Scaffold this active site. Structure first.
Site, PDB file in Angstrom:
ATOM      1  CB  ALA A  52     -79.459  -0.939 -30.084  1.00 33.17           C
ATOM      2  CB  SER A  53     -79.608   4.203 -32.746  1.00 36.60           C
ATOM      3  OG  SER A  53     -79.539   3.973 -34.122  1.00 36.60           O
ATOM      4  CG  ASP A 112     -67.739  -0.356 -39.241  1.00 42.15           C
ATOM      5  OD1 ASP A 112     -68.499  -1.195 -39.806  1.00 42.15           O
ATOM      6  OD2 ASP A 112     -66.883   0.322 -39.855  1.00 42.15           O
ATOM      7  CB  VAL A 113     -70.981  -5.485 -37.682  1.00 44.54           C
ATOM      8  CG1 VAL A 113     -71.608  -5.311 -36.313  1.00 44.54           C
ATOM      9  CG2 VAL A 113     -71.927  -4.922 -38.739  1.00 44.54           C
ATOM     10  CG  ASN A 122     -81.507  -4.965 -35.853  1.00 44.23           C
ATOM     11  OD1 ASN A 122     -82.184  -5.419 -36.787  1.00 44.23           O
ATOM     12  ND2 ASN A 122     -81.567  -3.697 -35.469  1.00 44.23           N
ATOM     13  CB  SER A 172     -83.444  -6.970 -44.349  1.00 46.08           C
ATOM     14  OG  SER A 172     -83.101  -7.983 -45.260  1.00 46.08           O
ATOM     15  CE1 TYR A 205     -88.218 -10.055 -46.270  1.00 43.58           C
ATOM     16  CE2 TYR A 205     -89.161 -11.720 -47.723  1.00 43.58           C
ATOM     17  CZ  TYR A 205     -89.022 -11.190 -46.456  1.00 43.58           C
ATOM     18  OH  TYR A 205     -89.742 -11.755 -45.385  1.00 43.58           O
ATOM     19  CB  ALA A 206     -86.326 -14.056 -52.161  1.00 45.36           C
ATOM     20  CE  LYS A 262     -88.104 -14.777 -46.490  1.00 45.74           C
ATOM     21  NZ  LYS A 262     -88.195 -15.839 -47.545  1.00 45.74           N
TER      22      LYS A 262
END
Ligand SMILES: c1ccc(-c2nc(-n3cnnc3)c3ccccc3n2)cc1
Ligand SMILES: c1ccc(-c2nc(-n3cnnc3)c3ccccc3n2)cc1
Lengths: 239, 246, 240, 251
Positions: free
Chosen positions: C19-20, C68-69, C95, C134, C147-148, C151
């Protein structure tokens, strides 16, 4: 003659029965030297007998696709006795374990795929063909796991195809539907009846009908097909 | 009594739009596999050229004039084929209808699917009788380089998929398969003409780094027509070298 | 009656990871704007402080925390701390030769955080899990591949987790941004931006806020029958 | 005789009311989903024109609007007719203004059904686009059909209509985007309608078993999504089909 795989070495994992075995026999029929794998020495020996009984050159061996060591050792053995495989075929539940199942399956595809790519890259030619799982397991958990594994397989296959395509290596998948195998033959009758009712063709598929698709994909006529998942399901589409 | 993998001996195949490019390669491939092949064109000169091509390659069959937009042309053409050659049990739909805009997609798709439907319904009666068939629909190649070309290609490809899957569901209990082949960039008259820098950039969107050949489309068709593809139905097989645009 | 049915988030605690800045920060402010108590997280103490300042300046109650997720320990500790000092987060927004490891890591992190927060949602019999995809990261073939792939993994994961938790009235959705105005896109040569814009029907970059608004809808009671969905927020630019 | 144009009759400023009197056309607004959509856009501050294919439907729409304090009208419209579409839109422009939000909810069997539905979407969409283009702003939202029937035919029709709607929506979005007009679809799953309310309990139980959320959706839950898509916050969403199905995905 057009469909011929003469001169090629093919590695088919899980070749001791069902779809894996049919794939091994079909690539053999087309002329490939076939190495079929099982997780036990007795399975490997059965594969070698099956091959011999159908007049196919090649061998059975022991392979654990979850292990880096088993994968490196097995490829080294094959290269030593034969040469580089340029065709490689990678062949109730709980509501919550879909994640570990998919993760493991894709980690195994990736592990074997990366290992065989070095040889295909040297040859500037290859076929990687990933076989999805058969429809069957019970209830919501089975449906969740099936749909997740299929989506993983499709996305994985497309991405790997993009990564290796400039080398004339194709990467495709075959997604079977309800196929007649040892694992589906003795599903409860009511589950079977309901699966048949969702299939336009009105019958189970045969292992051989999967293998024919694999044999086409491995051929020179499928050289412009890559990144694809070919559903082999009699018109039954489940997302 | 023969029984071989891939053989189409004894079958009659109808291939629409067979005078050039993909359609002609498909016609020759089914001929190679043993089919009697009827290729069609919308003009008498196209039909003659098809007959000559077939003859020159030792394929039995004919070139006929067919307008897939017309019920009368469709009924007449099938009647002729039934009289002189037999019922087509393999039917390949390859016929489709200055610069290209992104507002053409509706009328193009609507016309193409209306024609697929018209022909498909007409040939189904024979296939239903035989309790066997193959219907194979060929998608359109990527037609232009920009946004309008992508829009039109993506629309036609989405229509074709959904149509194919639906028809397959409708006719499957009769052991008739309905599949589609969706080409990407194929080496045809369109591609041969464009600027060298634009070509390079085109090839840069294709992981295999080359244009597809008409023959590579035809080989997929030939597989789908065979007995080994009997449990494939409702599918669209992309033949695009790894170039996926929707 | 027709005019008064709450689509606000008053009384809810929301956890927004990463969230930063950029999208994560806009999401944190939007959920704050709708009334949620917001915990935003960052991987550093400095990022946490920046989040607390941003929240305070906009009059949003909550906190900035370090999380740290990728770590089970960081996840268990941070949730325990939130439960003690604020309450159970019932809205969770995730996120925070390359493509395989990237996707694998991302999904392992989503899975880890999701499982950890599910206990509280199960107890409340209500929840919202919202995964943020992303943005289009890079221009060429490698960028398209990554990206694909990311996703496709996000969508399948999202659909499967939704099926797993739906009987508990917990929804699991994703938002897949296209080209968004962030530090990445700001740095492009002026002309190269024009060519990028030519692939987007709307002819402009999206704003972080436009992603946030979609999240804020998914979090609401009006989105209660939406689950397993991935909402593309890309101005009509679709790439697979 | 039949009157075809009915106004709703309608100093509180509701917090919800952000569409600022903009004009919204909702086809098929006399019941179920269409009606909930009309009320939700009213709740958000639109002047709402709901349409039905009969004069009695149009009157019912006007009464419903009035009873909820929504400004607008019920009109007769047949989306399958070029003449009805041109005449009705001309009438709306004269008497209420250009609709900048348009919701299409009025729509061997599968082929003619999909074809007709897409032709209607196209006809209405093309007609309203001139006004949106002038305003440099618009929202077109297409509503898919609910899961209509239980068996193979129902599944074929549903999957075909859905695939047509998605591909159409994406293509039209690409065509009209440079004008700041968005085009999206909402694809419902199983919704609580008059039809589903009265199924035998054993059949309802089996239906609910295919839905992860374990319940039918409400018409209002569809409307809320439509309302979000219509707002300024959905401005970068275009070409999208939002499924609203409780996690039940059928293809
Ligand atoms: C079954 C499944 C899908 C379609 C169909 N029809 C269309 N279309 C029809 N007429 N104009 C456009 C389409 C237009 C754009 C994108 C997808 C379309 N799909 C038809 C039957
Ligand atoms: C449920 C559904 C899908 C996936 C999953 N996992 C992946 N993946 C996993 N681990 N590394 C890559 C993927 C990689 C590339 C493309 C799609 C992927 N999908 C996981 C669970």
């Amino acid at each position: 003659q057009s469909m011929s795989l003469q001169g090629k070495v093919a590695l088919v994992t899980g070749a001791s029965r069902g779809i894996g075995q049919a794939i091994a026999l079909e690539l053999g029929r087309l002329g490939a030297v076939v190495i079929g794998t099982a997780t036990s020495a007795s399975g490997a020996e059965k594969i070698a007998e099956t091959l011999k009984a159908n007049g196919v050159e090649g061998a059975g061996l022991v392979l654990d696709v979850s292990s880096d060591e088993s994968v490196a050792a097995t490829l080294e053995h094959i290269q030593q006795h034969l040469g580089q495989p340029l065709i490689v075929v990678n062949n109730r539940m709980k509501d919550d374990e879909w994640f570990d199942v998919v993760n493991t399956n894709l980690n195994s595809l990736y592990r074997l795929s990366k290992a065989v790519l070095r040889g295909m890259t040297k040859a500037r030619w290859g076929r990687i063909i990933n076989i999805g799982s058969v429809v069957g397991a019970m209830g919501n958990a089975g449906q969740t796991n099936y749909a997740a594994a299929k989506a993983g397989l499709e996305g994985f296959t497309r991405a790997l195809a993009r990564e290796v395509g400039s080398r004339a290596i194709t990467v495709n998948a075959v997604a079977p539907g309800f196929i007649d195998t040892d694992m589906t033959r003795e599903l409860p009758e009511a589950q079977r009846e309901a699966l048949l009712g969702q299939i336009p063709l009105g019958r189970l598929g045969q292992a051989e009908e999967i293998a024919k698709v694999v044999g086409f994909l491995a051929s020179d006529g499928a050289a412009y097909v890559t990144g694809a998942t070919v559903p082999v399901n009699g018109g039954m589409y489940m997302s």
